[PDB]
Amino acid sequence: IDFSKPFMSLGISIMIKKPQKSKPGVFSFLDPLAYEIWMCIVFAYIGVS
């Protein structure tokens, strides 16, 4: 067959699931230290006092 000139230029692209915000948790300031450190800081405080 004899095609016509392209009326739509396209190609192979990449589709990924649309991302979004990570809604930082209310208590997201205690992340820099693991839970056990936080629990053991209170214990060390009650013990030093």
Binding site: D31, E36, I37, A44, G47, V48
Partner: protein
């Protein structure tokens, strides 16, 4: 995430409890000395 595990900072706790142990011992040594002197 990459929150600092207790294994990463576990020497500051041994030192802390060790110093508390030493502190009590020093106090009791002072006490025992003066107590016997009495």
């Amino acid at each position: 995430t990459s929150a600092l595990s207790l294994s990463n900072v576990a020497g500051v706790f041994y030192i802390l409890v060790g110093g508390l142990g030493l502190a009590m011992l020093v106090a009791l040594i002072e006490f025992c000395y003066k107590s016997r002197a009495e």
